[PDB]
Amino acid sequence: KAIQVAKQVFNTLTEYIQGPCTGNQQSLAHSRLWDAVVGFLHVFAHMQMKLSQDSSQIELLKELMDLQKDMVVMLLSMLEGNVVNGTIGKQMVDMLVESSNNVEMILKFFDMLTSSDTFKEYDPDGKGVISKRDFHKA
Structure with a gap:
């Protein structure tokens, strides 16, 4: 329920700006948007x-x-x-700095497509149902 809630909130806050409303963008920059996004990325x-x-x-x-x-x-x-030397980017980058650990974990989980690549080496006929030990071996 809370996932759907925050999803709808994010959708509204995009459609404020999905047509590039500059005053909206500047208000969102000068806000607690990033103190929310850090905890969201932590839990992710x-x-x-x-x-x-x-x-x-x-x-x-x-x-x-x-x-x-x-x-x-x-x-x-x-x-x-x-903009090239944009403030939105700078505040995003401060946000990206203070929670580097969780970014690393998310990217490392997304090191993954690279799981069917290691599949045909021990497949008997390219079926889909290879052994668990064939999987660890592969």
Whole structure:
């Protein structure tokens, strides 16, 4: 429920600016947007890894990934009218600095496509159902 809530909030805050409304952009820059995005990325880094392990709860992983997707889409729509020496970029970069750990974990989880590449070496007929030990071997 909260995932859908914050998703709708992000969608509104994009459509304020998805047509590049400059006063809206400057208000969002001079705000607590980044103190929210840091905690969002913290929980994404932890729970994406923590939840990917268990196959019992995978729909929540999809929902959280879509939430993170719409958040980075907001961060892109912050940069439609992105000036070269832009302040929006600078504040985004301060945000990107203070939570480098979680960025590293998210990128490293996304080191992954690179899981069917290591599949045909021990496949009997290219089926899809190779052994778990063939998988660890591969």
